Amino acid sequence: MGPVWRKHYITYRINNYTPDMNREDVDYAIRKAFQVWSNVTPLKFSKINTGMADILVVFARGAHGDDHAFDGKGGILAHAFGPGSGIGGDAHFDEDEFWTTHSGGTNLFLTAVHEIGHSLGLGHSSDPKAVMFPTYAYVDINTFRLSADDIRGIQSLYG
Ligand SMILES: NC(=O)[C@H](CCC(=O)O)NC(=O)[C@H](CCC(=O)O)NC(=O)[C@@H](CC(=O)O)Cc1cc(-c2ccc(-c3cccc(Cl)c3)cc2)no1
Ligand SMILES: [Ca+2]
Ligand SMILES: [Ca+2]
Ligand SMILES: [Ca+2]
Ligand SMILES: [Zn+2]
Ligand SMILES: [Zn+2]
Numbered sequence: 001m002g003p004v005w006r007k008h009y010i011t012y013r014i015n016n017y018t019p020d021m022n023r024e025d026v027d028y029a030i031r032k033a034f035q036v037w038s039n040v041t042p043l044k045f046s047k048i049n050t051g052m053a054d055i056l057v058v059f060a061r062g063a064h065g066d067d068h069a070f071d072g073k074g075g076i077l078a079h080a081f082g083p084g085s086g087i088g089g090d091a092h093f094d095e096d097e098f099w100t101t102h103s104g105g106t107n108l109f110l111t112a113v114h115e116i117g118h119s120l121g122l123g124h125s126s127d128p129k130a131v132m133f134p135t136y137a138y139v140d141i142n143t144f145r146l147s148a149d150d151i152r153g154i155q156s157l158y159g
Pocket of ligand 6: 118
């Protein structure tokens with residue numbers, strides 16, 4: 001019962017890139033994270049490089065211009081705004097983390113799946129196997145799956 005996008009075509013734009021990973025791997029992690037949610041909804045996501053994207057993806061540090069300051073390495077990993085204009089939908093990742101493609105540091109793909117869930121209107125889950133559980137855990141991204149609770153939540157908002 002959060003806000004929802006009132007359309008099924010949603011654009012995203014990567015505002016800037018963490019130096020922790022190469023550009024190609026950031027693009028891949030974000031694209032695959034959107035695909036997790038498009039696989040179970042009517043939503044489609046396209047990446048744009050200019051113009052007026054719905055979901056801006058940002059890496060930033062500490063106090064970074066909104067009311068949700070980051071805390072250095074550890075603790076908060078990222079945060080995201082629910083659907084809406086302007087800053088609505090945007091997903092912010094704490095650059096004081098070490099973002100990775102793998103099990104070390106903080107896995108960008110898994111964090112992005114969680115944050116995009118918020119960007120689409122989801123809240124938190126009580127299921128410890130749900131990607132929308134409040135605290136991060138690494139799972140083999142090659143075999144990652146949304147939990148049945150995640151699919152229930154997002155199918156209740158769209159379709
Ligand atoms: N507290 C913790 O365990 C870690 C600490 C990291 C550290 O200090 O080293 N930090 C977090 O989990 C933070 C802060 C939590 C808090 O203090 O309340 N959590 C976040 O940053 C989330 C913020 C938000 O709600 O948007 C972001 C988040 C959650 C996840 C996540 C990823 C995978 C899973 C998961 C779990 C089980 C199975 C599967 Cl498939 C997936 C669950 C959650 N990724 O990013
Ligand atoms: Ca942090
Ligand atoms: Ca936005
Ligand atoms: Ca970093
Ligand atoms: Zn922010
Ligand atoms: Zn969350």
